[PDB]
């Protein structure tokens, strides 16, 4: 009875049985480390979604870039309302950038302890907020 045979028999038994699956995310406790990995996906997903939209529209939509910017100027420009879309663009990018460094630092083997996760994680958040409020102001 090899390890590969044991597994084929596990899946054969359980799927063919009226056994329920034990609840996971519905019951498992929220921790900062987890919530920050979830957000890293979303930012990553959202960010590619934008890079794809920007590149895809460069091929599909008529007119140049300025042409599209003059259409932005035309939609009754809000004063602080323009600083919002500018922040909404830059907030996920900064978060994903900082936490990305954090991921690279883990990939090196450093800072992988429960205390060090809470600190480095909290540092990322502060770094996101500050460089997000900072960039939108440029």
């Amino acid at each position: 009875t090899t390890a590969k045979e044991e597994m084929e028999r596990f899946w054969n038994k359980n799927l063919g049985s009226n056994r329920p699956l034990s609840p996971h995310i519905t019951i498992y406790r929220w921790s900062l480390p987890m919530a920050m990995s979830i957000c890293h996906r979303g930012t990553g997903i959202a960010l590619s979604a934008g890079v794809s939209l920007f590149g895809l529209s460069a091929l599909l939509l008529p007119g140049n870039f300025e042409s599209h910017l003059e259409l932005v100027k035309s939609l009754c420009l809000g004063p602080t309302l323009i600083y919002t879309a500018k922040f909404g663009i830059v907030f996920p990018l900064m978060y994903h950038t900082w936490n990305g460094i954090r991921h690279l630092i883990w990939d090196l083997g450093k800072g992988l302890t429960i205390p060090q996760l809470t600190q480095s994680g909290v540092v990322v958040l502060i770094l996101t907020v500050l460089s997000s409020v900072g960039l939108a102001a440029m």
Binding site: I45, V51, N64, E66, K73, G100
Partner: protein, 102 residues
């Protein structure tokens, strides 16, 4: 008996530290040369990123190949689309520069 999985991983981290190289390197000194390498790194790092999400969530071999191919197309159009924007329009750097001047 290749090392294709670990080479992928090291490649991912490479372009990751390379894209982190280019973001500051683009603000300081924006040029034609920087726009294409940003399009390269951007779509590549992006492509391999979605690759992981696909392999994680897309269950079954039937859908696995389709998602991959479907993503390959979406990436190849994204890269070429940015390179078009780079040659035939203002370019990524200056496009952002204009967007932030607004």
């Amino acid at each position: 008996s290749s090392k294709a999985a670990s080479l992928h991983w090291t490649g991912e981290r490479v372009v990751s530290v390379l894209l982190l190289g280019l973001l500051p390197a683009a603000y300081l000194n924006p040029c034609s040369a920087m726009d294409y390498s940003l399009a390269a790194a951007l779509t590549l790092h992006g492509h391999w990123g979605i690759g992981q999400v696909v392999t994680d969530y897309v269950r079954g071999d039937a859908l696995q190949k389709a998602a991959k191919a479907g993503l390959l197309a979406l990436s190849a159009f994204t890269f070429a689309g940015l390179c078009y924007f780079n040659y035939h329009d203002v370019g990524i750097c200056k496009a952002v520069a204009m967007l932030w001047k607004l």
